[PDB]
């Protein structure tokens, strides 16, 4: 709440998952790749698509 | 005639090489050998035979 005012710099806050030295136990985690080498330009639409 | 890599060059989002050699037909025959210029110190192409 607190920092939701601010219209000029984002601000997540929150809590560690328990295990650190697991980074992130939540949900999901996949990476996109470019496999039949198609370009940083086409391989950020479909960051955006998806 | 041994051909030489200069430094990388990208392709399709790649790291490959660049080569530099002689075409096919000046290293084939012994004679090709002296078709090729060295500049000397004062300016000028000598060829191999000299």
Do not use: C
């Not at chain 2, 210029?37 to 004062?42: E, F, G, L, S, T």
Request: hydrophobic letters at 40%; proline letters at 5%.
């Amino acid at each position: 709440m607190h920092f939701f005012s601010f219209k000029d710099a984002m601000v997540f806050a929150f809590a560690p998952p328990s295990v650190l030295e697991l980074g992130n136990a939540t949900g999901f985690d996949l990476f996109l790749q470019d496999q039949a080498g198609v370009g940083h330009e086409v391989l950020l639409q479909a960051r955006n698509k998806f | 005639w041994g051909s030489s890599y200069v430094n990388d060059f990208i392709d399709r989002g790649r790291v490959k090489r660049v080569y530099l050699q002689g075409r096919p037909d000046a290293r084939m025959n012994p004679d090709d050998l002296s078709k090729w210029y060295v500049r000397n110190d004062k300016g000028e192409m000598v060829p191999f035979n000299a």
